[PDB]
Ligand binder design. Structure first.
Ligand SMILES: CC(=O)SCCNC(=O)CCNC(=O)[C@H](O)C(C)(C)COP(=O)(O)OP(=O)(O)OC[C@H]1O[C@@H](n2cnc3c(N)ncnc32)[C@H](O)[C@@H]1OP(=O)(O)O
Ligand SMILES: CC(=O)SCCNC(=O)CCNC(=O)[C@H](O)C(C)(C)COP(=O)(O)OP(=O)(O)OC[C@H]1O[C@@H](n2cnc3c(N)ncnc32)[C@H](O)[C@@H]1OP(=O)(O)O
Ligand SMILES: CC(=O)SCCNC(=O)CCNC(=O)[C@H](O)C(C)(C)COP(=O)(O)OP(=O)(O)OC[C@H]1O[C@@H](n2cnc3c(N)ncnc32)[C@H](O)[C@@H]1OP(=O)(O)O
Ligand SMILES: CC(=O)N[C@H]1[C@@H](OP(=O)(O)OP(=O)(O)OC[C@H]2O[C@@H](n3ccc(=O)[nH]c3=O)[C@H](O)[C@@H]2O)O[C@H](CO)[C@@H](O)[C@@H]1O
Ligand SMILES: CC(=O)N[C@H]1[C@@H](OP(=O)(O)OP(=O)(O)OC[C@H]2O[C@@H](n3ccc(=O)[nH]c3=O)[C@H](O)[C@@H]2O)O[C@H](CO)[C@@H](O)[C@@H]1O
Ligand SMILES: CC(=O)N[C@H]1[C@@H](OP(=O)(O)OP(=O)(O)OC[C@H]2O[C@@H](n3ccc(=O)[nH]c3=O)[C@H](O)[C@@H]2O)O[C@H](CO)[C@@H](O)[C@@H]1O
Ligand SMILES: [Ca+2]
Ligand SMILES: [Ca+2]
Ligand SMILES: [Ca+2]
Ligand SMILES: [Ca+2]
Ligand SMILES: [Ca+2]
Ligand SMILES: [Ca+2]
Ligand SMILES: [Ca+2]
Ligand SMILES: [Ca+2]
Ligand SMILES: [Ca+2]
Ligand SMILES: [Ca+2]
Lengths: 458, 458, 458
């Protein structure tokens, strides 16, 4: 049996945040969730997450895919593991211990760690890495024979030990039985006055039990995030990982170091992404679609062959061949049918737009059901709100909504109808009719010579 | 005589694209075109490009500045060179062989390669580089005396040869006569079952003929692009090269690592470019012009002293001193005269705008001929389309187009005229006249207390 | 006593600019000002800045916090220091000499430099660093005993000296008395025919006086900016420094390598900044505020809990809880009250907006005094200009301004009033009234079948 203990009860003072450190997001999900996903790879029979600081909030995210234990007082990583005793003490197996603030460690690395622990028959295996800047990390102390002696914390380290480049990642595999026994022998006699889980290594060394170290193939994965500088580094590595995956799958990136794509976004092959594109949440991008600089898509599905030019799209569906932008805003609950064109400075919200309809400019379409082949002249405003309630407008197929018209819901524009430009519409317009609601033009000869803008008046 | 063979017939499976690999763009032009430009530096008497996979498409780009030979089946780089036998076999001279997927090799490096081949009197000179990550590249095998023995491909390499850091760039210079003779001795006995051009090196070694290696001064230039991860690296190096050139010429970049300027864009000294600016195609930027974050210019000429603030400009001419933005869109076939101001949320298309005219906000000017000193009030819409045809509007000098007016083409607004705000204009407005086409305001005392928005009704 | 000499009279030919090199900005202020700020840390009793090339302009920036001396002809760094003789010759103390084009040297490093000069009792201490690319920098020549012999300039260096990696940063501390005496012994016998300040090192070596070198702890700080490539590097290092500071203070950055925040911008803890955000000048951001990709804020104060979504805000005040964007433009002299919402394609200028007012779309509010709980329908345009003068509009509390209305200043919309959508308003609207100024809708049955957009006509 394999067990897993995730430490997530720490205060994260260095984060300077009211939000528990492990809940800070990296590429769209909490660091804790990235850790949960990696832990999942070793398929533990039992997973125990230790919560403390604002345990209330932490238990929210994934409150069933693991057991929870509360650490009333954050007395140390070692003490946090102690909190799992009621559930794990007494069982036999291999127990993975991992921090909730090391989101870059992969499930593959954990599986490699477990495999190594088993094959070498260690009582404890430490996941390690090397770095030129080990400040803040426990250092792996070895002897002339490269044998692991112990782990020394930054605060407790001497000037000499601080020069060690091999660091403790905060992840280990322990024989479950021996783990809790060794735990009984740790105390708060250190620079932090805390119960260090790292002290069990020295304990196993005293008993002569086998202690090994499995080194990460990719040292970038070792990042421990204690502050926002490290969080930004975590974002950079995860961003590179996600984008690398998309490029391998056939997606071109003008600049993968500057494109922000969340962990679960799906992107089909042949999609072209310019730099500075943001794709978040449950977003899916279809084949050959082009996303230009500035595009920001959240929880939306975009079809194939679409061209999203510097536009923001939220909780919406965009069909194949659609063109949006530049500077368009497709708000929640919108659906853009096949080959629809939404041009610059257009806002669509809570509306369904039929195939081949076009709204090229300076338009607002809200709470509307719009047919196919409809044309919205520039400046068209669908009026749907009266200060208390929202009203719906239905627009048929092939309707021509004149430029600068004002459509006051609830009304229906029948198939093939035309609304004259500049018109305010307060009543239904029958299919095949035209509707005009505007003042007639009157010219006043020479009147301009009397006004401030005239050249002769300045 | 100098000859050049460009290999561009490969399938590029790793690219996962329906577009032939060599046609993928880097800074605005295909990798193949960057290679063509470098080959041009050695001024070959004959240039032969080998096409195969979708030869149809490849022959499109530059179908005269070189000879073409078809490779029906892609049996290997060696076999591709064989396809040029009908044209080059029998001739005397130095033949450059280069891949169409190594777009960073410069003409200067090729000239250095040729010079070295000649001075050292080699029968074959390989252009090489060193890299910590040689995966996928042929490795340069040498003896204790640093003599070139052969080139071994990744697939065919043993675990030991894979540790070689010196790689084959895929570019060489060969005595033309010996090249084709050695070619007769290559076969498909390898891990890929292909005719490797790299096997001629081992052949020259058997005959004792002189084989040399000329190393790139800049190892970044050695990049071979087989997938989109490498393509993005190619974009990064080329972007750095282009931007470096502009900075040397007096252009300031807030962040040259995040500014996207195509290979042939011209930029005058003293231009200031914020980060995240995109300049594409045949674009030219005049002296002292400021381009702010988000600006996207395609095939346009912008004058001197202009300030383009986060705006998109396409196939247009922008005169000196013009200010555009933020969030403006100058569409194809527009000309903005000197000192014109286009403000936020304005779209100009197929229109000529005279000097000093201003359109500061939420306006659409389409298919219009507009004079000098004209003022477009916010919300002005020029209506030019009836669902079938486009109509033109002519606006004279010093015209004042009232806010939220709707101008229905075809009409002419005469010099100095004024269109009242909120007016729909369907007829010509004479010079010096004013035109008003809107309903008169009527106030209904206390009526608001009866509506949903009123505070007493909620 | 401590004295300081800042060299800022050079021509900066390599900058290819009409603006004196030291005045080019890095993170919002001139390189010269960054140098002034560092010099300030050693609290000199006298500060003398040497000006020459366009001295007029240079004296502008900070024309009181230092003494100025003119160098009529730029004959060299050594000659520039000579220009300070009338003020400093004869005094006793330690004199810091620093270039105006090394903006990354910190006050802390200068304080360390001075401390080292004093403790080692040197007659001259050179601030040095190491770099793999020393091209253009004076090289620090030492003997087998690591003793400083002299500094050799790039132009004057032999092929052998050019391989030296230890460079002169252009900053030194000299015993003031000895400095000017040694200066008497320098001449223009060099590759540049200039009086090199660097030659005084060789002079002190002849007299046997103590010469030391204090090395920068951070080599990035050593950058000497002679062209725009180096200026961009200066921007990158300063940007990293500023952003690092904000992250340490509790601000999260999705990408600190691509976020552009000026040197004096204040940002409260818990603020979240996406990549590609620009904050300039005297900007202040309140706690927990979210700034999304593309936001550009200049000289504005933004409160706590605000969400600025891809919008440009200039010389304005934004209260707590305000939401702006996407694609909004808050222009100079605007104040947005608490909980105000400004949506997409809205422009606010010279206007005060009361608490909880909303303007969600395609609206222009200029020169208006707007009350609380006001609602601006999409397409609303406040008309404030007649081609010569600007007029003000006053809008009371709870006013409902209908979509696509045109409000022609100067007018007042009384409390709770409603302006009908599509209306042009030319007169005051009393409190509790409604005002309607638009044409009534007329429907023409079957008329559409006769128009170009109708399906039966194509
Ligand atoms: C900016 C872009 O995106 S471009 C694409 C958007 N395109 C547009 O908005 C174009 C819309 N076009 C219009 O609004 C045009 O003015 C149209 C289509 C209404 C003009 O149609 P026309 O038939 O040529 O106008 P016409 O003057 O003949 O009037 C037709 C009928 O309406 C009546 N009418 C005209 N103007 C008005 C008015 N202001 N109020 C009331 N009735 C009016 C006429 O009396 C006539 O009635 P009758 O036939 O019973 O005598
Ligand atoms: C938001 C920005 O960018 S700001 C800059 C844009 N600025 C603007 O849009 C401002 C435009 N200004 C306007 O539209 C103003 O209402 C103006 C200039 C038309 C007002 O002009 P005024 O001369 O003061 O109006 P006035 O009421 O006196 O009317 C002038 C004539 O037109 C007539 N008229 C007025 N309103 C109307 C109407 N709705 N329909 C028909 N005729 C009208 C009057 O009867 C009068 O005729 P008469 O002289 O034969 O009796
Ligand atoms: C897109 C968004 O952001 S959504 C939010 C913005 N929301 C809006 O803009 C909605 C604004 N709503 C409107 O403009 C509506 O048309 C309203 C509120 C004016 C309609 O009000 P109603 O009371 O239902 O209209 P109703 O037809 O009964 O007219 C009321 C009075 O005005 C008169 N009237 C109506 N239309 C007109 C007109 N065009 N010209 C002159 N008088 C008119 C009527 O004769 C009536 O007068 P009476 O009571 O003396 O007989
Ligand atoms: C003593 C110890 O373990 N040191 C390790 C820990 O140091 P480091 O100082 O980084 O440890 P942290 O304080 O961040 O705590 C580690 C993890 O344990 C949790 N936690 C902490 C204290 C507590 O009482 N309860 C609790 O649940 C935190 O939520 C965090 O997820 O991680 C580093 C790598 O990232 C290692 O190099 C250090 O050797
Ligand atoms: C056997 C060989 O040459 N190996 C070299 C080739 O490997 P590599 O595996 O990278 O070679 P590729 O398959 O990409 O082919 C090289 C070039 O030849 C063309 N092509 C390929 C096969 C074909 O039948 N016809 C054809 O025209 C491709 O279009 C491409 O432009 O480039 C590397 C550097 O980039 C070198 O380090 C390798 O030593
Ligand atoms: C001879 C000398 O000093 N060389 C140093 C100078 O070279 P470097 O060639 O970089 O020197 P610059 O020409 O840039 O001049 C140095 C500074 O002195 C000022 N200036 C220059 C000439 C003049 O007549 N008047 C004047 O005021 C410039 O405005 C600049 O701020 O800086 C480098 C580091 O940045 C050092 O490595 C070089 O050893
Ligand atoms: Ca801790
Ligand atoms: Ca930690
Ligand atoms: Ca229908
Ligand atoms: Ca191949
Ligand atoms: Ca290749
Ligand atoms: Ca004219
Ligand atoms: Ca309008
Ligand atoms: Ca100089
Ligand atoms: Ca310099
Ligand atoms: Ca009031």
């Amino acid at each position: 049996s394999n067990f897993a203990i995730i430490l997530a009860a720490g205060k994260g003072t260095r984060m300077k945040s009211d939000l528990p450190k492990v809940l800070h997001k990296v590429a769209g999900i909490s660091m804790l969730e990235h850790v949960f996903r990696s832990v999942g790879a070793i398929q533990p029979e039992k997973t125990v997450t230790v919560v403390g600081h604002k345990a209330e909030l932490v238990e929210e995210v994934l409150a069933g895919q693991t057991e929870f234990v509360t650490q009333s007082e954050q007395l140390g990583t070692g003490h946090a593991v102690m909190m799992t005793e009621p559930i794990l003490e007494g069982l036999s197996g291999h127990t993975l211990v991992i921090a909730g603030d090391t989101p870059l460690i992969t499930g593959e690395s954990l599986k490699n760690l477990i495999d190594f622990h088993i094959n070498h028959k260690n009582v404890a295996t430490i996941l390690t890495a090397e770095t030129d800047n080990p400040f803040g990390y426990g250092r792996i102390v070895r002897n002339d024979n490269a044998e692991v002696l112990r782990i020394v914390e930054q605060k407790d380290a001497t000037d000499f030990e601080k020069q060690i480049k091999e660091i403790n990642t905060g992840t280990y595999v322990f024989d479950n039985e021996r783990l809790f026994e060794a735990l009984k022998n740790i105390n708060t006699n250190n620079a932090q006055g805390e119960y260090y889980i790292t002290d069990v290594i020295g304990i196993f060394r005293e008993t002569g039990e086998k202690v090994g170290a499995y080194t990460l193939k990719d040292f970038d994965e070792s990042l421990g995030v204690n502050d926002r500088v490290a969080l930004a580094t975590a974002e950079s590595v995860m961003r590179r990982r996600i984008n690398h995956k998309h490029m391998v799958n056939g997606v071109s990136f003008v600049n993968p170091e500057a494109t922000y794509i969340d962990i679960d976004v799906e992107i089909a092959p042949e999609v072209q992404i310019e730099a500075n594109v943001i794709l978040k949440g449950q977003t899916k991008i279809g084949a050959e679609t082009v996303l230009t600089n500035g595009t920001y898509v959240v929880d939306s599905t975009i079809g194939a062959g679409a061209v999203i030019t510097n536009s923001m799209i939220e909780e919406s569906s965009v069909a194949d061949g659609v063109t949006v932008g530049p500077y368009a805003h497709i708000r929640p609950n919108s659906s853009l049918g096949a080959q629809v064109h939404i041009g610059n400075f257009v806002e669509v919200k809570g509306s369904s737009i039929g195939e081949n309809t076009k709204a090229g400019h300076l338009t607002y379409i809200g709470n509307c059901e719009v047919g196919s082949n409809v044309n919205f002249g520039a400046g068209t405003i669908t009026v749907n709100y009266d200060g208390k309630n929202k009203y719906k407008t239905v627009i048929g197929d092939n309707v021509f909504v004149g430029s600068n018209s004002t459509i006051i819901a609830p009304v229906e524009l029948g198939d093939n109808s035309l609304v004259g430009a500049g018109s305010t519409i307060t009543k239904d317009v029958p299919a095949d009719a035209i509707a005009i609601g505007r003042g007639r033009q009157i010219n006043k000869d020479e009147y301009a010579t009397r006004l401030p803008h005239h050249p002769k008046n300045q």
